[PDB]
Amino acid sequence: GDDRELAILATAENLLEDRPLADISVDDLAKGAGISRPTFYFYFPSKEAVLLTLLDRVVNQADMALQTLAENPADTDRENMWRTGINVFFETFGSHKAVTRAGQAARATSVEVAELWSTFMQKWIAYTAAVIDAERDRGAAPRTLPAHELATALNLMNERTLFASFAGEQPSVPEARVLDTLVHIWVTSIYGE
Amino acid sequence: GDDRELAILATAENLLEDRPLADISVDDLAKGAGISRPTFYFYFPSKEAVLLTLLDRVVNQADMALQTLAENPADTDRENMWRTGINVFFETFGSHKAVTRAGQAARATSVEVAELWSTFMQKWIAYTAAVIDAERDRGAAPRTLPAHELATALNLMNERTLFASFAGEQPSVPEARVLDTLVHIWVTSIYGE
Numbered sequence A, B: 001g002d003d004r005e006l007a008i009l010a011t012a013e014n015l016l017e018d019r020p021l022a023d024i025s026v027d028d029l030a031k032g033a034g035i036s037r038p039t040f041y042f043y044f045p046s047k048e049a050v051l052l053t054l055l056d057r058v059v060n061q062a063d064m065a066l067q068t069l070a071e072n073p074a075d076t077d078r079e080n081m082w083r084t085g086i087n088v089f090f091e092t093f094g095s096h097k098a099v100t101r102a103g104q105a106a107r108a109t110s111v112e113v114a115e116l117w118s119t120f121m122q123k124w125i126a127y128t129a130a131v132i133d134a135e136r137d138r139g140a141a142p143r144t145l146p147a148h149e150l151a152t153a154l155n156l157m158n159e160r161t162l163f164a165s166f167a168g169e170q171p172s173v174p175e176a177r178v179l180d181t182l183v184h185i186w187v188t189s190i191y192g193e
Ligand SMILES: CCCCCCCCNC(=O)N1CCC(C)CC1
Pocket: A082, A085, A086, A089, A093, A100, A124, A125, A127, A128, A131, A154, A155, A158, A159, A162, A163, A166
């Protein structure tokens, strides 16, 4: 039950590497998972539900890694503190580029995908603002913009910029340059007057 | 000829304020422009072509305003120089929110929309990098990140963040706060070490 489900999810992630969800039939999913079409429909209502589950897994993997870091601070300067946090997103979404691409496309057509993405962006922005607020309270960062507004723009930059790098968009920052680029902008905008 | 074309474009921009392009028939466009369906097809091949033309107009309005500013520098500090430039995009796209929303949706399904947006983002990034390079050459900005990579991330931040504000997304920076938020991040990241 868990095993046919994981086989369907694994098949979908593999097929998304080579074509969009629109070009994957539920027949393709059932065939890769070694089940029939009706048996598929027992585990998922639709191929869209399979993508929602894949995206939910990736988003929660990033969130749990951020929670781990939040509990287990690295012993490092402020630049490295922010770099390690942005790296959670770089590594987690960068390790699942096909699901990342497909999920972003699904935001336009799926209220459940849009709501999942909104929920976690709100969480990550709130955490970012709490860290900025802590840095200001300790005297390490200046009281410039409203922390939640700064956090929002920085998180949206990372969403757009990581996505463009992963998707090979024109324009994009090269993938081998994107982490340093984002870290610079975060550190200067958080600590700068 | 120019006048029936402008009537079709005006009808489309008005109807996009209240519903997506998928919910606008070519009958609706012809009716608002005071022409028949076949007469529509004389001026545009499709409703998608009408949106491409609307987006082309808005993008070139922003580009021409940036060209005007590039030729007619304001007599102001570095913060105001960048604020005036970001404001071109805030005002131009903010004055055409329905076309902005519809154009962004069309990038997923229209190679011509995607290519139009890419072409102008490349232009605006190249201009941004040239200004950063000039600021470094004059000794006003430090030689930190590769200017074209910094420019790319900043332009992508503005694309995503302005869009979220205009579209009322959750999350977003309030529209009345977005210009100050972006200016801060640009100035600190360009001038900061
Ligand atoms: C391609 C999809 C990528 C989506 C990335 C969206 C989140 C970006 N947010 C961050 O990078 N964070 C927030 C938390 C702080 C502590 C570290 C930095």
